[PDB]
Amino acid sequence: MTMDATALPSELLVTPQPLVGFCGLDTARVSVHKAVWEAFSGSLQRKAADRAAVQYKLLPEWYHPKGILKRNWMLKHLHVLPSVVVLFQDMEWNDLQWTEKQVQCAAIVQALKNTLQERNTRLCLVLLQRAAPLPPGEDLLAAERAASLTNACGITSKMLFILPHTEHLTGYALRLESAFLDMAQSYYALMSKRIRNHRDQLTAAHTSLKIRHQFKLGFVAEMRQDFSTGQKHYFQAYANLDEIRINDGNCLEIKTLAGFLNYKICRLMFKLKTPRDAINQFIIHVEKHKSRVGFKDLAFEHHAWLSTQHSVFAELFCEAIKNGLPALQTQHPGIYYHKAAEFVMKRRDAAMEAYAAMQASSVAEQQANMQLCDQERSYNHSAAIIALLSQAMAQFKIYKCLRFRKKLAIDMAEEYLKSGDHAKALTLYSLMLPDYRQEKWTTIFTDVLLKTLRCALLSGSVADYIACSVEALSLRHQSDQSERILILENLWQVFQGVPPMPKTQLTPEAQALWTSALANVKSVEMCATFERVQLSNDDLLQLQLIVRVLTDIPLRIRSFHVILADAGNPQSYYQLFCSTEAQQFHENTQLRIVRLEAHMGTDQVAALLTCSSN
């Protein structure tokens, strides 16, 4: 009435299936019963369609509805009440043991039916036989047994069954499956009759009860593989939810109900091979819900639910893929993963100012908001962003949308930086530079480059630091000149061991990081100019390579080395006296330079723009 219709998150996320249960038993009877139990699980072994959909639980102002009034009654409707109960003993004709088992089985099934009457589950009686098969029509004592047991508890003869050995037990377990299915379905149809005869009446326009009735009958139809009546009922329940215009800040219960039935309807669509329907539903719903909230909006609201909603819908997509629905994938494989990811980022941000407002001051219900603040503080982990982008990246790779994998990987790296775990971030950036450099998009390339330098300096990975710095040098004309100069001087500093000057930009811990390093770390665009390739019998070659500098700020002129190329035999412009080659070797000789060995100001470039052949 005033309480919530249903409060179960992730209700029956698993495929709803028929559920038959029966009384708990000791280890030795179940030890004889083993072969029967793995005969049951052979359906799990066999293909799912060959598997009977049933499952095994193995237990030990109008007036409100029965069994429907509560969400806990509802959860009971899930599993707590199997639609079939079967009492297990062995059927064994005997002399005195026969009578003893008669008396005891009669009494126990008597209590069992005393339990089962109100819950209306019918109690079918199936008994094991290890003895030789009985020819029907031969034993009149079997007839007396049937009479006595049937009159013991009112369970009819047809309900009674016999459990033979495996070669027959297989087919008879299967026909048992069929009978259990039939009587469960009869139960479910009856229970739906209950629902409908309740539905005819109304509690003077509450319609929450109506939603409960549709949702219960959704259980029923989903359960019975109808897949249709339930989804119609879900549609109608959601509609009547809508006609309930929001009274007040209690939009959250509405949104939760919406998400529940929304999952239900979408997945039921996916069961029915109606992807377009599902897509339109989920969009319609999510922007409806975006428009839903106006206030409070404690920034818990609209963020967590929306992210979870996208999450669930991508999960439904994956369910569809498991089914085999590629119509939705060929358009876009991992649609809502990274929308959910951006929503959880927004959620962390919202948490930031939620904190901030909590520092403002903190007479009714306010303590609840306080525990809310604390609980979302628990949520400040935001590794969920990482997981969501992980799934998004995988799914994007599934259909070759590499642009977005790169974008979401940079998002991963930047949140790693917010995570502080700059190491993984620099690993990502290290992988991500080459693709952009090939891509030539000169805007983005420097934009990621400055961040990559930031990661290198914080990490103290001086090798990557210098490499990305020198590639920035090669074409740094987009940025300001003095910054180029500072980069270069920091580079020389670190080649000869001096820490970089942005000391306030650095922290003592990172100081330790890169003071520690360089123990293993060892060893502007210009051109190689060879005057004479394909050497003849006698010649000489001097400094003809021309070291053009694209950077404005000059490279300091101290030294340089060129390593004599092994091709064949092992051996503002600045033109100088270096002039290595002055000797004679064998003819038909060519040359090719690995790296600059740039000892002008720096020791060496460590980045391969020392072209071999232009």
Distance in angstroms (rounded) separating the CA atoms of residues 454 and 227: 55
Calculate the CA dihedral of residues 471, 473, 474, 475 and round it to 10 degrees.
100
Give the pairing of strands 573-574 and 547-548.
antiparallel
CB 467 within 8 A of CB 607: yes
Same domain, 503 and 608: no
Q: What is the CATH number of the domain that holds 90?
A: 3.40.50
Omega within 30 of 0 (cis) for the link into 297? yes
What token pair was written down for 37?
Answer: 């139990």
Residue 5 located in a structural domain = no
Distance of CA 28 to the CA centre of its chain: 42
Residue 208 located in a structural domain = no
Residue 113 located in a structural domain = yes
Q: Which residue has the tokens 């029509």?
A: 137
In 93-204, beta strands by DSSP E? 122-128, 161-163
Task: Determine the angle formed by the axes of helices 166-199 and 208-223, rounding to 10 degrees.
Answer: 160
Q: Which residue has the tokens 């060129």?
A: 562
Same domain, 491 and 590: no
What token pair was written down for 314?
Answer: 């991508």
What token pair was written down for 443?
Answer: 């805007």
Strand ordering across the sheet containing 122-128: 55-56, 19-21, 84-87, 122-128, 161-163
Residue 34 located in a structural domain = yes
Centre a 10 Å sphere on the Cβ of residue 236 and count the other Cβ atoms it contains: 14
Which H or E run contains 171? Answer: helix 166-199
Q: How far is CA 327 from CA 267, 274, 277, 330, 405, in A?
A: 15, 10, 12, 6, 21
Nearest CA to 272 out of 310, 234, 314, 323 is that of 323
Q: How far is CA 480 from CA 342, 477, 484, 552, 554, in A?
A: 33, 7, 7, 10, 15
Q: How far is CA 1 from CA 67, 199, 217, 591, in A?
A: 15, 15, 19, 89
DSSP codes of every residue in 475-497: T--SS-HHHHHHHHHHHHHHHTT
Give the pairing of strands 161-163 and 122-128.
parallel
Distance in angstroms (rounded) separating the CA atoms of residues 545 and 526: 9
DSSP tag of 381: G
What token pair was written down for 297?
Answer: 């909006």
Long-range contacts of 424-433 (CB under 8 A, 24+ apart): 425/455, 426/452, 426/455, 426/456, 426/459, 426/461, 426/464, 429/455, 430/464, 432/406, 433/468
What token pair was written down for 605?
Answer: 């470039």
CB 261 within 8 A of CB 238: yes
- In sequence order, the 6+-apart residues with CB closer than 8 A to the CB of 361 are none
Same domain, 544 and 584: yes
- In sequence order, the 6+-apart residues with CB closer than 8 A to the CB of 8 are 71, 74, 75, 260
Residue count (the chain)? 614
Q: Which of 177, 199, 221 is the last residue of a domain?
A: 199
Same domain, 587 and 466: no
Same domain, 56 and 172: yes
Q: What angle do CA 231, 233, 239 make, to 5 degrees?
A: 105
CB 237 within 8 A of CB 214: yes
Nearest CA to 22 out of 84, 74, 73, 79 is that of 84
CB 119 within 8 A of CB 59: no
SS3 546: strand
Chain breaks in the chain (C to N over 2.5 A) after: 60, 362, 523, 571
Residue 515 located in a structural domain = yes
Number of domains in the chain: 3
Same domain, 75 and 133: yes
SS3 162: strand
Residues β-bridged to residue 19: 55
Distance in angstroms (rounded) separating the CA atoms of residues 278 and 315: 13
Letter string b/e over residues 545-572, b meaning 16 or more CB atoms within 10 A of that residue's CB: bebebebebebeeeebebeebeebeeee
Distance in angstroms (rounded) separating the CA atoms of residues 426 and 432: 9
Letter string b/e over residues 402-434, b meaning 16 or more CB atoms within 10 A of that residue's CB: eebbbbbbbbbbbbbbebeebeebbbbbbebbe
Q: Taking the CA of residue 122 as centre, how many other CA atoms within 13 Å lie in the half-sphere pointing to its CB?
A: 21
Distance in angstroms (rounded) separating the CA atoms of residues 341 and 316: 17
Residues β-bridged to residue 86: 124
Q: Taking the CA of residue 388 as centre, how many other CA atoms within 13 Å lie in the half-sphere pointing to its CB?
A: 25
- In sequence order, the 6+-apart residues with CB closer than 8 A to the CB of 20 are 54, 55, 56, 57, 82, 83, 84, 85, 86, 180, 184
Same domain, 76 and 191: yes
> Phi-psi category of 172—alpha, beta or left, where left has phi over 0 and alpha has psi -120 to 50?
alpha
CB 461 within 8 A of CB 517: yes
Residue 346 located in a structural domain = no
- In sequence order, the 6+-apart residues with CB closer than 8 A to the CB of 194 are 66, 67
Same domain, 600 and 469: no
Q: Which of 506, 522, 538 is the last residue of a domain?
A: 522
Q: Which of 522, 543, 564 is the last residue of a domain?
A: 522
Same domain, 472 and 590: no
Which H or E run contains 513? Answer: helix 508-516
- In sequence order, the 6+-apart residues with CB closer than 8 A to the CB of 31 are none
Distance in angstroms (rounded) separating the CA atoms of residues 422 and 510: 11
Distance in angstroms (rounded) separating the CA atoms of residues 259 and 306: 9
Distance in angstroms (rounded) separating the CA atoms of residues 39 and 168: 11
- Experimental determination technique: cryo-EM
Distance in angstroms (rounded) separating the CA atoms of residues 290 and 139: 73
- In sequence order, the 6+-apart residues with CB closer than 8 A to the CB of 146 are 157, 160
Residue 375 located in a structural domain = no
Same domain, 34 and 110: yes
Q: How far is CA 36 from CA 48, 163, 167, 174, 347, in A?
A: 19, 9, 12, 11, 52
Please classify residue 152 by burial: count the beta carbons closer than 10 Å to its beta carbon, then call 0-12 exposed, 13-18 middle and 19+ buried: middle
Same domain, 530 and 516: no
Give the pairing of strands 161-163 and 55-56.
unpaired
Which H or E run contains 544? Answer: none
What token pair was written down for 449?
Answer: 């480059």
Q: What is the 3-state secondary structure (H, E, C) of 88-123?
A: CCECCCCCCHHHHHHHHHHHHHHHHHHHHHHHCCEE
The sign of the dihedral angle between the CA atoms of 131, 136, 138, 141 is positive
Residues β-bridged to residue 21: 85
Which domain covers residue 455, as residue numbers?
A: 432-522
Q: What angle do CA 259, 265, 271 make, to 5 degrees?
A: 135
DSSP codes of every residue in 228-263: SHHHHHHHHHHHHHHHS---SSTHHHHHHHHHHHHH
Same domain, 108 and 68: yes
Residue 319 located in a structural domain = no
CB 90 within 8 A of CB 130: yes
Distance in angstroms (rounded) separating the CA atoms of residues 464 and 462: 6
Centre a 10 Å sphere on the Cβ of residue 394 and count the other Cβ atoms it contains: 13
Give the pairing of strands 161-163 and 573-574.
unpaired
What token pair was written down for 326?
Answer: 């590629």
Distance in angstroms (rounded) separating the CA atoms of residues 369 and 24: 45
Distance in angstroms (rounded) separating the CA atoms of residues 321 and 454: 41
CB 329 within 8 A of CB 397: no
